[PDB]
Amino acid sequence: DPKYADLPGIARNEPDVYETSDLP
Amino acid sequence: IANQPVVIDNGSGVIKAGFAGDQIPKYCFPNYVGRPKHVRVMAGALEGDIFIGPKAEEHRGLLSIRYPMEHGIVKDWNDMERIWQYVYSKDQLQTFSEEHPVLLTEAPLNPRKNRERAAEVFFETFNVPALFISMQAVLSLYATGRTTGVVLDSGDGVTHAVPIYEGFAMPHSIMRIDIAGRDVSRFLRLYLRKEGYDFHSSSEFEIVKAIKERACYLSINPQKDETLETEKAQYYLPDGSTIEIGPSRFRAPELLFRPDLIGEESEGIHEVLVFAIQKSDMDLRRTLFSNIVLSGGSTLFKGFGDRLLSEVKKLAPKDVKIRISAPQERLYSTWIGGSILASLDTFKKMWVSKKEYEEDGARSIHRKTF
């Protein structure tokens, strides 16, 4: 997050991990 | 001299640099080779005649932006002379060619010629103490901490999937493609002419890329949203001129999944990665479903990975848990990975000494590059 602020070309509000809806 | 090595976060569209150990590169800038196209009438005019940095980032209405790294692959070594010539500026460096070791990066599936000529440059013209150049995917994995993982890395005229299990020599399984956002933006210039926006400059292209990163997203439904009525998002220039978009913002990246829209046979990022999966093994494949390393700034879109998740879900069989890993710094992940790797002691053998290349040739390093 602080390094995410330090550089300009960084967007947020999206989880870095995308997984499948693993139906239990 | 073997001081803190210069970690250079390269890139097709964005080639920047910093150091090792640091977590912020002090020289962040893209790929752009511009130069004024006018005659100095009134003396005292700002010059340099090859504008990069704030000059180029200030005098956009005069430059002819050139690009040797066509699809990341350099085509103009003279443009590289000028690129490093600007890079070698002390306001851009504060050093020499020897004051620090250099850490340059690469992309997989590239000719030797590139490394050859570049070695000539930085070890003959420039005189780098120690340097090794290799794929950015490894550095991205360093930043993820993972070792086993499919690195989906995309440049700006480059998009590729790099399947990796603990960094093993798997070039047959490892794939690479060279097609992305540069061309997509050019296709957006085609959109402009279809819309009526009469534009043909590289400076205008920069603004299109500003929209690309700014006023351009993704959806997940291709044909559905195509049939769905848009809103025509009015973009505003620095001047502030109304620029409607429509669904073109996510229509243009459909080509990244549908390569024939530009008239180029391929299979789309997803299927190409699936082909990389095919070359792997069923047991290791499940790991790679869980180990997906999306990277590249070009991959920054609304539900980019989520759409791609749906894609591979339509591709991969049942009971397949696909898991993506994609930090917000899908650029500096390579830079920080090089910042860590360059900060190693075993790294001696990993780098190449100056005199070594000066002894026989780059083919020794080509042995070292695999």
Partner: protein, 138 residues
């Protein structure tokens, strides 16, 4: 032996889950510089398994027999015992040149013990049979 002992001690220090837990917090902070360099960049594990490879050869070696015997029979059989202990080679993987010069230094140590046992008769002026018997056994 000191190396192996230190390997054990400091490897327990290494495997202390408290420091490892600090590393867990550090990797959670994603500062993979120190963590990954501490893991990978430290060839300690390699040194551990290396001394573990030499471990039987660095164990129960009959060298004190040359340091505690003045009999050519005892010393000669001690040589044999030492030789047999030196069969742990391929199962230890020790450097050829280091092995050569190592055993070479050992041969010098042997010669030192030989001078030690040698300095006891001086059969050149005292009895000739001492010269005969001891010279033959030597």
């Amino acid at each position: 032996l000191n190396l192996e002992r230190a390997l054990y001690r400091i490897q327990e220090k290494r495997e202390s889950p408290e420091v490892l837990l600090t590393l867990d917090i550090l990797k959670h902070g994603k500062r993979f510089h120190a963590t990954v360099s501490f893991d990978t960049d430290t060839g300690l594990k390699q040194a551990l398994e290396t001394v573990n490879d030499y471990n039987p050869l660095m164990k129960d070696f009959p060298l004190n027999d040359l340091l505690s015997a003045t009999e050519l029979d005892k010393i000669r059989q001690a040589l044999v015992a030492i030789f047999t202990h030196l069969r742990k080679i391929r199962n230890t993987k020790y450097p050829i040149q280091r092995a050569l010069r190592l055993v070479e230094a050992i041969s010098r140590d042997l010669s030192s013990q030989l001078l030690k046992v040698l300095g006891t008769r001086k059969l050149m002026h005292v009895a000739y049979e001492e010269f005969e018997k001891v010279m033959v056994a030597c």
